[PDB]
Structure formats: structure tokens, C-alpha cells
């Protein structure tokens, strides 16, 4: 069901190496609904190429637009398993400190802060 489950470490690593060659200015992000989540819908896709200059605040807005949420729905985004310390960091900076060993940046979203 989950991405890491669907693809071998060898396949996830090769996918990241190709995004580097074909989309060198993009951050390879896996965005996944929390396996618990009741309220928010699932995304149309799993794998996003994020322009490496957007900060985490703009990425939340993108995903809320993608889910077509409205003003008073709540949305929480974990990066690499934990809360974001700051939303003003450029995703290029976040990638270098929070990327997995396969080379993707893993994110999970839910409606409560208690995932
Ligand atoms: C970039 N972006 C997307 O819609 C995902 N995407 C674009 C290509 Br090209 C492939 N995937 C949003 C998250 C910032
Ligand atoms: Cl590019």
C-alpha cells in the first residue's frame, strides 16, 4: 500500500538518480496520507517534483490547493517522521537535512496534530 512497500530500496534509489538527470532543479518528495486519517481525501499521486526555491509554507498551500481544502479545514504535514521546526526554510535546505537514504523526502499529512 505505502510507497516504500511498493518499490525496492534499489528502485527508489534509481528513480531519484533519474529525477537528478531529467529534473535537476526539483526536490523529489513523497507525500502520503496518514494511514489513520478519516477526514482529508487522498492525493491523486504520491511523487511530486517540488521547485527547490519554494519554502515549506508555500508547499503546504500547494497541497491544500491540490486536496481542494477550504479555509477552516485543518492540515498537518510531518517531514521525515516529525513536525517541521519552521515553515520559512527553503525546501532545498530541508531536503539536505531531512532526506531519506533512498534520496526521497518523505511527508505525511493528517487533520489532527496527534497522528
Ligand atoms: C511541482 N509540483 C507538482 O505539482 C508535482 N509535479 C510537477 C512535476 Br513536472 C511532476 N510532479 C508542486 C508540488 C510543487
Ligand atoms: Cl529541472
Swiss-Prot record:
Effect in UniProt of substituting residue 115 to A: Impaired localization to autophagosomes
Effect caused by changing residue 48 to A: Decreases C18 ceramide binding
GO terms (BP aspect): autophagosome assembly; autophagosome maturation; autophagy; cellular response to nitrogen starvation; cellular response to starvation; macroautophagy; mitophagy
Compartments in which it is found: Cytoplasmic vesicle, Autophagosome membrane; Endomembrane system; Mitochondrion membrane; Cytoplasm, Cytoskeleton
An annotated Gene Ontology molecular function: microtubule binding
Assigned keywords, A-Z: Autophagy, Cytoplasm, Cytoplasmic vesicle, Cytoskeleton, Lipoprotein, Membrane, Microtubule, Mitochondrion, Phosphoprotein, Ubl conjugation, Ubl conjugation pathway
Bilayer topology annotation: Lipid-anchor
Superkingdom: Eukaryota
Record's comment on post-translational modification: The precursor molecule is cleaved by ATG4 (ATG4A, ATG4B, ATG4C or ATG4D) to expose the glycine at the C-terminus and form the cytosolic form, LC3-I. The processed form is then activated by APG7L/ATG7, transferred to ATG3 and conjugated to phosphatidylethanolamine (PE) phospholipid to form the membrane-bound form, LC3-II. During non-canonical autophagy, the processed form is conjugated to phosphatidylserine (PS) phospholipid. ATG4 proteins also mediate the delipidation of PE-conjugated forms. (Microbial infection) The Legionella effector RavZ is a deconjugating enzyme that hydrolyzes the amide bond between the C-terminal glycine residue and an adjacent aromatic residue in ATG8 proteins conjugated to phosphatidylethanolamine (PE), producing an ATG8 protein that is resistant to reconjugation by the host machinery due to the cleavage of the reactive C-terminal glycine. RavZ is also able to mediate delipidation of ATG8 proteins conjugated to phosphatidylserine (PS).
Predominant subcellular localization, coarse grouping: membrane
InterPro entries in the record: Atg8-like (IPR004241), Ubiquitin-like_domsf (IPR029071)
GO cellular component: autophagosome; autophagosome membrane; axoneme; cytoplasmic vesicle; cytosol; endomembrane system; microtubule; mitochondrial membrane
Substitution effect: residue 66 to A: Abolishes interaction with TECPR2
Pfam (any one): ATG8
Consequence recorded when altering residue 53 to D: Increased interaction with WDFY3/ALFY, no effect on SQSTM1-binding
Quaternary organization: 3 different light chains, LC1 (a cleavage product of MAP1B), LC2 (a cleavage product of MAP1A) and LC3 (produced by one of the MAP1LC3 genes), can associate with the MAP1A or MAP1B heavy chains. Interacts at microtubules with CABP1 (via EF-hands 1 and 2) but not with calmodulin. Interacts with FYCO1 (via C-terminus). Interacts with TP53INP1 and TP53INP2. Interacts with TBC1D25. Directly interacts with SQSTM1; this interaction leads to MAP1LC3B recruitment to inclusion bodies containing polyubiquitinated protein aggregates and to inclusion body degradation by autophagy. (Microbial infection) Interacts with Hantaan hantavirus glycoprotein N; this interaction contributes to the virus-induced degradation of mitochondria by autophagy, which leads to degradation of host MAVS and inhibition of type I interferon (IFN) responses.
Functional summary from the UniProt entry: Ubiquitin-like modifier involved in formation of autophagosomal vacuoles (autophagosomes). Plays a role in mitophagy which contributes to regulate mitochondrial quantity and quality by eliminating the mitochondria to a basal level to fulfill cellular energy requirements and preventing excess ROS production.
Name used for this protein in its record: Microtubule-associated protein 1 light chain 3 beta
Organism: Homo sapiens
